[PDB]
Ligand binder design. Sequence first.
Ligand SMILES: *[C@@H]1O[C@H](CO)[C@@H](O)[C@H](O)[C@H]1NC(C)=O
Ligand SMILES: *[C@@H]1O[C@H](CO)[C@@H](O)[C@H](O)[C@H]1NC(C)=O
Ligand SMILES: *[C@@H]1O[C@H](CO)[C@@H](O)[C@H](O)[C@H]1NC(C)=O
Ligand SMILES: *[C@@H]1O[C@H](CO)[C@@H](O)[C@H](O)[C@H]1NC(C)=O
Ligand SMILES: *[C@@H]1O[C@H](CO)[C@@H](O)[C@H](O)[C@H]1NC(C)=O
Ligand SMILES: *[C@@H]1O[C@H](CO)[C@@H](O)[C@H](O)[C@H]1NC(C)=O
Ligand SMILES: *[C@@H]1O[C@H](CO)[C@@H](O)[C@H](O)[C@H]1NC(C)=O
Ligand SMILES: *[C@@H]1O[C@H](CO)[C@@H](O)[C@H](O)[C@H]1NC(C)=O
Ligand SMILES: *[C@@H]1O[C@H](CO)[C@@H](O)[C@H](O)[C@H]1NC(C)=O
Ligand SMILES: *[C@@H]1O[C@H](CO)[C@@H](O)[C@H](O)[C@H]1NC(C)=O
Ligand SMILES: *[C@@H]1O[C@H](CO)[C@@H](O)[C@H](O)[C@H]1NC(C)=O
Ligand SMILES: *[C@@H]1O[C@H](CO)[C@@H](O)[C@H](O)[C@H]1NC(C)=O
Lengths: 237, 50, 249, 193, 49
Amino acid sequence: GVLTESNKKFLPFQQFGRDIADTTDAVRILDITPCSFGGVSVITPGTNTSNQVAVLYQDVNCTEVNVFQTRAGCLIGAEHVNNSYECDIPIGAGICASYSIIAYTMSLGAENSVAYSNNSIAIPTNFTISVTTEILPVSMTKTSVDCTMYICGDSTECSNLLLQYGSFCTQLNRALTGIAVEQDKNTQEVFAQVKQIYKTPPIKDFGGFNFSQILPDPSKPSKRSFIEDLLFNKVTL
Amino acid sequence: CSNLLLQYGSFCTQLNRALTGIAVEQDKNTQEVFAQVKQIYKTPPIKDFG
Amino acid sequence: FAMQMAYRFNGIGVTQNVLYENQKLIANQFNSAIGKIQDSLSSTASALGKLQDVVNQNAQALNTLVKQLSSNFGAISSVLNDILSRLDPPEAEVQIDRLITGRLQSLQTYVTQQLIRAAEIRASANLAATKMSECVLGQSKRVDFCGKGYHLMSFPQSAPHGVVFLHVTYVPAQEKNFTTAPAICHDGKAHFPREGVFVSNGTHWFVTQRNFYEPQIITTDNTFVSGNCDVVIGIVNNTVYDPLQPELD
Amino acid sequence: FNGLTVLPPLLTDEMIAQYTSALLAGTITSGWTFGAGAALQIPFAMQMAYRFNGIGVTQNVLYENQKLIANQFNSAIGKIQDSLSSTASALGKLQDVVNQNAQALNTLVKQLSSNFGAISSVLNDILSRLDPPEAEVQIDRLITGRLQSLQTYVTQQLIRAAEIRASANLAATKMSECVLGQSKRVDFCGKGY
Amino acid sequence: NGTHWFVTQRNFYEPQIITTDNTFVSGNCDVVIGIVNNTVYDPLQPELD
Ligand SMILES: *[C@@H]1O[C@H](CO)[C@@H](O)[C@H](O)[C@H]1NC(C)=O
Ligand SMILES: *[C@@H]1O[C@H](CO)[C@@H](O)[C@H](O)[C@H]1NC(C)=O
Ligand SMILES: *[C@@H]1O[C@H](CO)[C@@H](O)[C@H](O)[C@H]1NC(C)=O
Ligand SMILES: *[C@@H]1O[C@H](CO)[C@@H](O)[C@H](O)[C@H]1NC(C)=O
Ligand SMILES: *[C@@H]1O[C@H](CO)[C@@H](O)[C@H](O)[C@H]1NC(C)=O
Ligand SMILES: *[C@@H]1O[C@H](CO)[C@@H](O)[C@H](O)[C@H]1NC(C)=O
Ligand SMILES: *[C@@H]1O[C@H](CO)[C@@H](O)[C@H](O)[C@H]1NC(C)=O
Ligand SMILES: *[C@@H]1O[C@H](CO)[C@@H](O)[C@H](O)[C@H]1NC(C)=O
Ligand SMILES: *[C@@H]1O[C@H](CO)[C@@H](O)[C@H](O)[C@H]1NC(C)=O
Ligand SMILES: *[C@@H]1O[C@H](CO)[C@@H](O)[C@H](O)[C@H]1NC(C)=O
Ligand SMILES: *[C@@H]1O[C@H](CO)[C@@H](O)[C@H](O)[C@H]1NC(C)=O
Ligand SMILES: *[C@@H]1O[C@H](CO)[C@@H](O)[C@H](O)[C@H]1NC(C)=O
């Protein structure tokens, strides 16, 4: 560590001085201050676009060691601009980075002032029909682990040694089975709202609304709609 | 001690990943709670609200 | 379906005539939005980020367990067969003890994170079931619960481990300024609209609905009297049409 | 100082305050129109009359008792001010969360200085004090103890993170419903209509 | 109140004279349990007179 002049007063019978955590803070008088240390993060825009990266030293005032200082530490390798854009790569303390690499302050949104005044209103004269896609996980893959086989791997002596360690394997198996049945119940409760399987009429006359792209297609790829087919092909297992 | 811990296993990576996920989750909670509106509105200078 | 869409317009406070005047426009807008969703799903990637993230988390946990299975845990070897074939029963027993302690700790840790992730997935599935019940099986009045704007309906679709809701909603647009008044003073009486808003384009006063511009002449049928013009702040003088005098005369 | 750091939040206090100010300005000037799209100006007296219609009261009541309603609202805001200024423990949940996190951190720090069956809890003393073999086994004991402590701390941190995520989801739902519009759910946005 | 019948709103006391405008007719009065006899004002007779 670093020896520093101490303003603390030590009694003649006192040799060491410990702060919270019972760790050494001062030694007979010199204060012990551990020298500069911290974390190092790398900000990159992806290897595809470029190989240029920036280095962030957090909780470190790097004046001792395109340098920019922020409440989250200090950034090296990214220019600091006085403009404001949407946050691409979050660094912290209101500071973000984007792609050379630019470091800026995240813009909260477009700034406007509504023309508020009494005896005055704004009324729409037109409408828009907007369809928004929202994705919610319903379940996850069910996995079962054989504790005896995983720990031992076809060994009788290891099995005997594990037997008298207690019934931890039974607890883990019960937890995994509960997780699996919980996933099954979640899927059932999400997708079994109705007890009857309704069918659309052969003629599709819904006043001009067209649902052939969300209804099952004649090609019958597992009887999935076009959008469902796209969603299934987008996720790689 | 570092050699002994790396010989012990790779728990540190999992623990760091969990902590990073917790931090990202907290940031997500703050963003979803407070950044619902994408436009910043300013109150008019005249305070005439009936 | 036109009548159902008109019912849902009534749910968001829009009369049926607004729909029936522009049924073709609404259908075309819905088709265009569906095509836009198609194009976004075909071209733009990472649209299913949550499912990919949870799948990757599960795969990473499994891979971490597999890799941790190959740790010495302070023993001479990370494989049990070599220790069994190389050591006498006491020393082999000690090494197996160390290996089992390490592997059991790893398995308990993995089961703990699996249970936490299962609880999170259960919460997400409960939210999805609530959305399906309140937006697919009916019209939801909650704001931003099933889309940005006035909710009209929702369509469910499957996903490898989730549900995709296409929320069809109504968004006002093409807004215009108007001059308003809390009530109308006629014959020394204050008239308030039954449902809607009093507006003025500069010279004439009309009554319409809040969510759409459908101006109508002021009439005793769409207004009610609840006193005089001495208590309401912002009263505006105007005539109120009575649809009985011309019939009588 | 022992590998424990606090990462600053991405959204600082000033930007969160700016978010709240923008939401309040949209609510006062527009009401619920800004939450469904473009903001629409309204004198906020007709907006309050619309809210009264929503709760089941005709606009005439408000247009006749506007002064009384405004006085009552101002008195209620003043009462809230007085309660927040004088009465303490008004933010018990946030204080409890902060003290819980601080207690967890302090417990981990204290656990960092445990023998765990070793000769001493100071690693450097063991290293400068003992020869490789049994020094290594003592270091192994210390590593097992400290790893167990850090793992249980991480487990409880994950549990508290899940609880905080649930609370934040509830808060976001309240902001979407109570603030951006009028909620018909009973007791969801306060007692009464 | 004690003798006179009015129609008001659920959440506020704003009594008004019973009128065909704010009331609707559905069947006879031999089925409803607890119905009472009262007059209903028709706002067309004074206009004709
Ligand atoms: C980078 O991404 C683009 C996406 O448009 C892709 O076409 C290109 O092949 C990628 N480059 C590399 C080197 O992967
Ligand atoms: C870093 O140190 C310099 C001088 O050593 C000082 O001026 C600056 O304020 C320090 N940074 C912070 C964030 O305080
Ligand atoms: C532009 O940004 C720099 C940061 O590197 C800043 O020092 C400078 O004052 C800015 N110019 C302005 C605000 O006009
Ligand atoms: C009219 O409305 C626009 C936005 O619709 C607003 O910017 C303007 O201040 C309003 N008043 C005018 C133009 O007098
Ligand atoms: C409303 O917008 C549509 C396009 O979305 C347009 O075709 C139509 O003419 C508009 N109606 C009015 C009254 O402006
Ligand atoms: C629905 O859309 C698809 C593609 O946009 C088209 O092939 C089909 O004919 C449409 N249906 C109707 C009834 O127009
Ligand atoms: C207002 O509307 C009425 C009828 O719609 C029309 O006669 C009058 O000229 C309009 N005035 C203005 C200023 O647009
Ligand atoms: C609007 O405010 C002005 C002054 O602030 C006042 O003279 C006018 O009477 C008000 N009108 C209404 C309808 O409140
Ligand atoms: C409205 O008319 C009444 C009598 O007809 C009059 O006393 C009052 O001053 C008028 N108000 C305005 C704003 O012209
Ligand atoms: C009830 O109210 C009517 C109208 O205000 C009044 O004429 C009558 O005397 C009242 N009766 C009682 C018992 O208060
Ligand atoms: C109420 O109950 C009493 C008996 O206690 C009965 O005489 C009366 O007719 C009932 N009135 C109504 C409206 O049900
Ligand atoms: C109401 O009047 C009818 C005839 O006018 C009578 O038969 C009935 O008994 C009356 N109701 C009561 C409660 O007396």
